[PDB]
Design a binder for this molecule. Structure first.
Ligand SMILES: [Ca+2]
Ligand SMILES: [Ca+2]
Ligand SMILES: [Ca+2]
Ligand SMILES: [Zn+2]
Ligand SMILES: [Zn+2]
Length: 162
């Protein structure tokens, strides 16, 4: 089945981009995980060494897999579907300048979307959904919220929270 066999996943941030302070990166990823966690029975916990379920890293060009990055612009990041090994992993192109505001390439926004893929979600045809295929940002980050479409998609796979 297109999903995880357990309801608890471990995650590890393998390396950090120099674009933002160490703490802003942690905060971005944590918030990203939290949005999915709020609408399902799933839980997460961090590891600092070893192989975790979701291995997050920042890389440039050819980085040991089938999909080399393309330099600044265009593809910003990609993730793999549920499963062991590389599956479930999320990679970010470091040729981008990652930020924590509304100016350029917001880490939280991209990560929230990439984590959606790590949990089994496909693309939505709804222009308002987090899982919509084309990149965009928001005027105000505090106004972020998943669309019902996003909710139904994740819940059809894992069910609602108790
Ligand atoms: Ca993995
Ligand atoms: Ca790129
Ligand atoms: Ca960079
Ligand atoms: Zn990759
Ligand atoms: Zn996508």
């Amino acid at each position: 089945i297109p999903k995880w066999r357990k309801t608890h996943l471990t995650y590890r941030i393998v390396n950090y981009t120099p674009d933002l302070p160490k703490d802003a990166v942690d905060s971005a990823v944590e918030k990203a995980l939290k949005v999915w966690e709020e609408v399902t029975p799933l839980t997460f916990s961090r590891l600092y060494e070893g192989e975790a379920d979701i291995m997050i890293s920042f890389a440039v060009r050819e980085h040991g897999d089938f999909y080399p990055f393309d330099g600044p612009g265009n593809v910003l990041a990609h993730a793999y579907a549920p499963g062991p090994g590389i599956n479930g992993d999320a990679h970010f192109d470091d040729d981008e300048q990652w930020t924590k505001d509304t100016t350029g390439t917001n880490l939280f926004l991209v990560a929230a979307h990439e984590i959606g893929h790590s949990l089994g979600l496909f693309h939505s045809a709804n222009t308002e959904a987090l899982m919509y295929p084309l990149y965009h940002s928001l005027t105000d980050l505090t106004r972020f919220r998943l669309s019902q479409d996003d909710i139904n998609g994740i819940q059809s796979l894992y069910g609602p929270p108790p």
